[PDB]
């Protein structure tokens, strides 16, 4: 269920709602949360 986006921040928004760890990379218009490791 990757979140569609363009920039990085755009991903952090929805990425935070799912995982506090906003640290992610928006590639191919897809948001892939890295998660807390």
From Swiss-Prot:
Site positions for Pharmacophore, responsible of Kv1 potassium channel pore occlusion: 25
Cell compartments where the protein resides: Secreted
Residues where Valine amide is found: 37
Keywords of the record: Amidation, Disulfide bond, Ion channel impairing toxin, Neurotoxin, Potassium channel impairing toxin, Secreted, Signal, Toxin
Post-translational modification summary for this protein: C-terminal amidation is important for activity. There is a 50-70-fold decrease in ability to inhibit Kv1.2/KCNA2 when the toxin is not amidated. This decrease may be explained by a 23-fold slower association rate (k(on)) together with a 2-fold faster dissociation rate (k(off)).
Superkingdom of this protein's organism: Eukaryota
Disulfide bonds: 5-26, 11-31, 15-33, 21-36
Tissue: Expressed by the venom gland.
Annotated GO MF terms: ion channel inhibitor activity; potassium channel regulator activity; toxin activity
Family to which this protein belongs: Belongs to the short scorpion toxin superfamily. Potassium channel inhibitor family. Alpha-KTx 06 subfamily.
Function: Reversible blocker of voltage-gated potassium channels with fast binding and unbinding kinetics. Has highest activity on human voltage-gated potassium channel Kv1.2/KCNA2 channels (IC(50)=0.11-0.16 nM), whereas its affinity for other channels tested was in the nanomolar range (hKv1.1/KCNA1, IC(50)=253 nM; hKv1.3/KCNA3, IC(50)=91 nM; and hKCa3.1/KCNN4, IC(50)=70 nM).
Protein name as it appears in the record: Potassium channel toxin alpha-KTx 6.21
Source species: Urodacus yaschenkoi (Inland robust scorpion)
Residue range from the parent sequence: 25 to 61 of 62
